[PDB]
Symmetry: C2
Subunit: 317 residues, 2 copies
Amino acid sequence: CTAITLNGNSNYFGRNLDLDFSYGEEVIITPAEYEFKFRKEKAIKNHKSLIGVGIVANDYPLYFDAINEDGLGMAGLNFPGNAYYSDALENDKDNITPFEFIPWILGQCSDVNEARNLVEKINLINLSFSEQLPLAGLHWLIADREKSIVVEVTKSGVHIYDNPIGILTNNPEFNYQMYNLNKYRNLSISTPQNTFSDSVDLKVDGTGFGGIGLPGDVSPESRFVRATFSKLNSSKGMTVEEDITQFFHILGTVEQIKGVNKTESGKEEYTVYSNCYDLDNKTLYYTTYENRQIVAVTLGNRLVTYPFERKQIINKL
Amino acid sequence: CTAITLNGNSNYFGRNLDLDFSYGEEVIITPAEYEFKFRKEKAIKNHKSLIGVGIVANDYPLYFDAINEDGLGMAGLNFPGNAYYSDALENDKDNITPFEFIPWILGQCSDVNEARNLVEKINLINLSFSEQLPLAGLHWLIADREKSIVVEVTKSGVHIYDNPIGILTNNPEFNYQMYNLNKYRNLSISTPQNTFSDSVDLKVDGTGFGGIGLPGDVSPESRFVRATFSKLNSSKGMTVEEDITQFFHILGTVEQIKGVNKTESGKEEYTVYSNCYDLDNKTLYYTTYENRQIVAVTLGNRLVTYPFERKQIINKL
């Protein structure tokens, strides 16, 4: 998984969902009076509306990512082994399941500060949605038009980090991912000088030499590095359309194609979908592995859904 | 630039055109009776028809790449400094400009062996199209449904290489590109074993560790390595549509986004367009930097042209 933010003519937040299968993902709009029920907390009958991507099971929206009517966004990304969900209730905390976490935050919080304060009161509990949808280890990126934070709940506590670059992937833990960038300081967008030695006449026979050292594989750390370099150096656009175009290009730099990442199961990890939320006008844009064309949907008590097209939509002249 | 072939349910050939500018390009169909004129050879009035991508100037099709009605493809890729165009005519060769080369081959040859034989009779001459369109150093991939060859005309001769992997980028010369792959033999699509040492308990906290070592930058050698690994390991598709989809994903692994590669002109090198020719049914599919949606066109004495749309075509729900 790779989640990023981007600030340009509007403000954006989005992710690649990388898995070795698809759950039949769909757009899900949760309106303000859809009642949210919680395994260990009282129901929330009136809340902020949400638009995002996920599945609906037993009339419950299981979001992978979403935004709310205020332009606050949240995404859950795989974090295996390090994620720690409590086997006991904590009487001094709100006891919330990982599948409830996106509703709990986005239904009640208008911005990153409010999200942080509510995360400071949580205990994530080890209760699965159903037998057929068991919990996976996750961490989260939470973003608004100004800033983002990372939430990592591990055996040592509920950790909240300011995210100075608007990038998240998978393991390792966030301070490790940030520290790991330090060794890439010498990368450049332009051809470097010969600092190796002026005693040998080194020659440049193509463009792009500045980036040599950048990692190309699809491990989560390499994707973290490559997405950071790609995003931070990406050219500014003059319009919102150009920004959304650039955003998909950025996510494309760390896309997983089928065949290059074979999991222990024998199945191929791939980028099931990519998306970009325009936080200021509350619009979701997405693509799927099977369909290159971008789809847009802009943000009652019933869930409203729209299933993703998994056919390549080609303009035939 | 990156050019590749793929063999699946049909047989495919295509490329990323990477440049730091674009004044537009277009689909160009050259029908069988468009008269090809040559600076130093007789005109060819009846030939094979072509479909490809390029620009038209003074009613001449200046192809970046094309296929003919027999499913033979050719692409010109930047090869600066190494390309050598003769200042003199050679009386024992056919004297063909570089901008005439695609017509010369694809107009007359049905398959790779014929192309090879006609290349063995050529002398590429240093004559520009016009004073406003100067010659660039290029090298070529030529491909049919069975195999491909690389043509590199340098100061030491007209060199023709069998291309065992169907991949070409820019400098260095082709034997250097192929030799360079050898140091990546231990890359893998799967998590490797700990061969570092059994005396330390090294842990794997994510998928994709097999690829670590793969280069991620947009230098031509790195792109050559990364396109090769991505193509050769790409999962097979069950239909032609799934193959085309996969082909665009492969070219995506080596796409240049605006901002990461600043050239000597101060401009940003980027993937202007991407394409995939189905050689068996003679259809051209393409995308552009500005428009993700795939456009398809299938293959008289006048050129027929279709200008590339440079707007993002979004499916709005």
